[PDB]
Amino acid sequence: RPRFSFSIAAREGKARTGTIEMKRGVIRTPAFMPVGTAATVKALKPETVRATGADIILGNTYHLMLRPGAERIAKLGGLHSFMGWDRPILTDSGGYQVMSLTKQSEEGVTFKSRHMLSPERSIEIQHLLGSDIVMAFDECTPYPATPSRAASSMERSMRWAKRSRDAFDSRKEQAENAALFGIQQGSVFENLRQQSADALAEIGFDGYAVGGLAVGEGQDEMFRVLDFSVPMLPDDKPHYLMGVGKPDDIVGAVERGIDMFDCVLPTRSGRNGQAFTWDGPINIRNARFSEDLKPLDSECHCAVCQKWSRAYIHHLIRAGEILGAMLMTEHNIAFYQQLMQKIRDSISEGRFSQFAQDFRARYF
Amino acid sequence: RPRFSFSIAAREGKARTGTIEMKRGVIRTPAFMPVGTAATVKALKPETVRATGADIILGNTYHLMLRPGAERIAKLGGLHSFMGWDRPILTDSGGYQVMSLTKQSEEGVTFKSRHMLSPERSIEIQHLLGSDIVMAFDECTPYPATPSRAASSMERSMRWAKRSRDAFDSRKEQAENAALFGIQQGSVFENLRQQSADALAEIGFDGYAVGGLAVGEGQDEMFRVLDFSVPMLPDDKPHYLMGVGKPDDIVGAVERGIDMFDCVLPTRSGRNGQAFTWDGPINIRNARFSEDLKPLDSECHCAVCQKWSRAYIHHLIRAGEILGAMLMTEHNIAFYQQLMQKIRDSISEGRFSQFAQDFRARYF
Numbered sequence: 001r002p003r004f005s006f007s008i009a010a011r012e013g014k015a016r017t018g019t020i021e022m023k024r025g026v027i028r029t030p031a032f033m034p035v036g037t038a039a040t041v042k043a044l045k046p047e048t049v050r051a052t053g054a055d056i057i058l059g060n061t062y063h064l065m066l067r068p069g070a071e072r073i074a075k076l077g078g079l080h081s082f083m084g085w086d087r088p089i090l091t092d093s094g095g096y097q098v099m100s101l102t103k104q105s106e107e108g109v110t111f112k113s114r115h116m117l118s119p120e121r122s123i124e125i126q127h128l129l130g131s132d133i134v135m136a137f138d139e140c141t142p143y144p145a146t147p148s149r150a151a152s153s154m155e156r157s158m159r160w161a162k163r164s165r166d167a168f169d170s171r172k173e174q175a176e177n178a179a180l181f182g183i184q185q186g187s188v189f190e191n192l193r194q195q196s197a198d199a200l201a202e203i204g205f206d207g208y209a210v211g212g213l214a215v216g217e218g219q220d221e222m223f224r225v226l227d228f229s230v231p232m233l234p235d236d237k238p239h240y241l242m243g244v245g246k247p248d249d250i251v252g253a254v255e256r257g258i259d260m261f262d263c264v265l266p267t268r269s270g271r272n273g274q275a276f277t278w279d280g281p282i283n284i285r286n287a288r289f290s291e292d293l294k295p296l297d298s299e300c301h302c303a304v305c306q307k308w309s310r311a312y313i314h315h316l317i318r319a320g321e322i323l324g325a326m327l328m329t330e331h332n333i334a335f336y337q338q339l340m341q342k343i344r345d346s347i348s349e350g351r352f353s354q355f356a357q358d359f360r361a362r363y364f
Numbered sequence: 365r366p367r368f369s370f371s372i373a374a375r376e377g378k379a380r381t382g383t384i385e386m387k388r389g390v391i392r393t394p395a396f397m398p399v400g401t402a403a404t405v406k407a408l409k410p411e412t413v414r415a416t417g418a419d420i421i422l423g424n425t426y427h428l429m430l431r432p433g434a435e436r437i438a439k440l441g442g443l444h445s446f447m448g449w450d451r452p453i454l455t456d457s458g459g460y461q462v463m464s465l466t467k468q469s470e471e472g473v474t475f476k477s478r479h480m481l482s483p484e485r486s487i488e489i490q491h492l493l494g495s496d497i498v499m500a501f502d503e504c505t506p507y508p509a510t511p512s513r514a515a516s517s518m519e520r521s522m523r524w525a526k527r528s529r530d531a532f533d534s535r536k537e538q539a540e541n542a543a544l545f546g547i548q549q550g551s552v553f554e555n556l557r558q559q560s561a562d563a564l565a566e567i568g569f570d571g572y573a574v575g576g577l578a579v580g581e582g583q584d585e586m587f588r589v590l591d592f593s594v595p596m597l598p599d600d601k602p603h604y605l606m607g608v609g610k611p612d613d614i615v616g617a618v619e620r621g622i623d624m625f626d627c628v629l630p631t632r633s634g635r636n637g638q639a640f641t642w643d644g645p646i647n648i649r650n651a652r653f654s655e656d657l658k659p660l661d662s663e664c665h666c667a668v669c670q671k672w673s674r675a676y677i678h679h680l681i682r683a684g685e686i687l688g689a690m691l692m693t694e695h696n697i698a699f700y701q702q703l704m705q706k707i708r709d710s711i712s713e714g715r716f717s718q719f720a721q722d723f724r725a726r727y728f
């Protein structure tokens with residue numbers, strides 16, 4: 001396989017469906033990436049993650065650099081071997097996590113256990129982890145943001161994008177086996193998003209992420225920003241909306257040109273008792289499910305819905321049992337992957353717009 | 365298959381190996397039963413429990429009667445359907461758990477959320493759960509015990525054994541599809557153990573458990589009591605040592621005539637970081653495993669040892685990750701089942717005594 005090849009097989013409006021071929025495997029798009037913060041998709045074996053339909057997962061530079069350590073993982077053979085996932089892995093740059101979970105300067109960021117992070121070290125950490133899709137080191141502008149602060153932050157991110165590109169290219173093994181994605185910033189302002197998109201295109205990346213969203217702005221605002229922001233990015237490269245994952249959010253983003261997604265909602269809310277269904281999410285802890293023998297979702301074909309009832313999972317979660325977390329999480333990620341499959345197929349068949357309408361009608 | 369048929373295929377000294385055929389499946393003996401307190405073997409799907417080699421699991425009358433409820437589980441189709449385990453299930457009577465996790469009288473026991481438990485209600489609860497092997501309702505004598513208190517308790521247990529037998533027999537469906545095991549008491553006193561064994565044999569049961577042990581007495585004392593206690597039980601019926609599970613404990617008990625075991629050690633200690641190996645247990649949290657690429661145990665053929673390193677599991681447990689619990693638990697139960705398989709095969713081949721010696725030499 002090639003280091004990286006994104007091919008668009010079908011389109012409908014701004015939506016696209018296709019594939020990204022990489023050395024470790026093929027990624028079907030639009031794609032959803034389960035999040036695996038500490039070298040594990042919480043409560044799931046890698047084979048279960050794959051069984052749900054996931055083609056790629058997301059790892060984090062921040063968490064892993066702290067524990068168990070980037071150099072250590074490299075010494076142990078890389079993240080893939082370490083956690084037992086042999087397919088593509090996209091790693092965030094750590095910038096966003098640092099300013100969420102510090103001394104900021106043009107050189108990078110320092111945090112407390114004093115650790116430092118810069119464009120060059122971020123890229124090196126992702127190399128040590130053995131990441132397939134490396135994210136440029138950026139600064140996720142807080143929401144809301146004044147145009148001045150948004151501009152300053154975006155400008156710094158573009159300078160860091162250039163530094164990330166060069167760091168990545170100076171490492172032969174990494175440049176030949178991995179891919180590099182740039183990240184668009186600019187808050188909710190069209191002129192800044194345009195400047196950011198242009199700066200990124202000038203540098204040149206294998207993919208372009210839309211950053212700075214999913215940080216407090218409602219869906220209406222997010223969609224408004226995507227409306228003018230995605231068209232600014234190179235059409236022949238993947239478009240990655242970072243941190244976005246809610247079912248309806250994903251459908252709307254795909255309708256606007258997004259090809260990739262990631263978010264902790266499926267996993268985290270799963271462990272909290274929230275199960276996704278085509279008729280909307282349900283809180284399995286609610287008393288009304290104590291004797292409900294139906295599966296989490298009536299149409300879902302995941303292993304959990306084929307074997308256990310809402311009543312049983314209700315019991316497990318209220319009892320604080322680990323199996324509860326395991327079952328809720330497997331179903332949720334499977335639901336997400338099923339959503340992506342439906343999106344891909346509808347686009348391929350030229351009926352995505354109708355699928356989106358039907359989805360919203362029943363989900364809400 | 366028959367409701368119950370215990371057959372001894374081979375012997376060596378006091379050790380025996382054979383099978384218990386029941387309607388839901390065959391149990392190979394000596395057998396180890398993973399414990400599933402709240403309708404779940406902690407951190408494991410039923411199929412994983414089966415994959416490790418388990419032929420039967422243990423459920424609890426106490427925990428389930430409280431949550432989610434015996435009548436409720438019955439309404440939902442029984443414990444088997446509820447948790448997704450379709451093979452034999454042995455249920456403890458709840459007596460021991462009550463006096464561990466209250467008003468005691470000749471009629472039974474009351475506890476606080478005021479609930480009552482008696483021989484008749486215990487048997488009814490196990491019936492509602494759909495248990496395959498029902499345990500008589502007894503009183504586990506605290507250790508140490510004066511001969512007077514030990515006698516009083518044992519005598520009451522025998523009266524309750526008679527009541528359990530009659531309750532079980534008066535329920536046609538239960539008497540025809542399930543089996544009933546009596547429980548020997550008498551603390552560490554030979555004369556009381558003899559009286560208890562005789563009273564149980566007079567009533568007649570499908571199997572006989574040695575109760576009152578694994579309650580604080582060292583292995584030396586436990587073995588001394590088993591030495592004279594097991595021979596008192598009917599030879600052609602299974603001998604079940606309740607709550608006993610440590611590797612060396614199990615080997616020694618089998619050497620003394622025990623056919624069945626159960627204990628939370630594999631699962632509970634697994635979640636705590638203790639992994640069993642042929643060279644003795646290890647605490648995976650220890651710093652010396654941070655970069656150890658070897659599997660938990662060098663010979664173990666479980667799925668965990670085939671895929672992940674000590675270093676990875678070390679990371680997961682120290683990070684408090686659910687997958688850590690899942691992997692540690694699967695390996696430990698698999699180790700226990702492998703121990704039982706080795707015991708069964710060595711007995712069948714007339715080299716168990718040698719296996720016990722070799723096992724102890726390396727394990728210690």
Ligand SMILES: Cc1cccc2c(=O)nc(N)[nH]c12
Nearest residue numbers: 096140211212213214242243
């Ligand atoms: C993970 C994530 C979510 C949402 C936004 C962002 C962002 O702007 N930059 C980075 N690196 N990551 C993000």
Ligand SMILES: Cc1cccc2c(=O)nc(N)[nH]c12
Nearest residue numbers: 460504575576577578606607
């Ligand atoms: C589970 C267990 C462990 C150890 C001892 C005992 C006992 O004596 N009686 C019952 N019912 N259960 C026991």
Ligand SMILES: [Zn+2]
Nearest residue numbers: 300302305331
């Ligand atoms: Zn499902």
Ligand SMILES: [Zn+2]
Nearest residue numbers: 664666669695
């Ligand atoms: Zn193992």
